[PDB]
Amino acid sequence: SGRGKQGGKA
Amino acid sequence: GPLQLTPFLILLRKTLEQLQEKDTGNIFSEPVPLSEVPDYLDHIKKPMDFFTMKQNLEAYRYLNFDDFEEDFNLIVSNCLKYNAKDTIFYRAAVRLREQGGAVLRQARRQAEKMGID
DSSP states (O other): OOSOOTTOOO | OOOOOOHHHHHHHHHHHHHHHHOTTOTTSSOOOTTTOTTHHHHOSSOOOHHHHHHHHHTTOOOSHHHHHHHHHHHHHHHHHHSOTTSHHHHHHHHHHHHHHHHHHHHHHHHHHTTOO
């Protein structure tokens, strides 16, 4: 994976 | 806008709406915004999303069922590649894959029964 999209924390 | 009515495009319209219905969060509804996710293309060769699929459909850029399916599969596979396993996005793509599979199986049967897969 890369840096990540905001708002993805479960 | 222009509107093409052929049995194959009718089937793709229905199937597409059936697929989008499974994306309850609208996570896959629009392109991932490169301006907010500037490393996305570092990882993803060909972004895909449902707005783009609709525009392809309506332009007659899907000529057979396989090509339509391949773009749905990209939506899923891109999401699984880019996002970490514990993220809501990854988990959403797993759910979409499994629910979309059933949709695509039924629709393909119809495309085959018509002379149009």
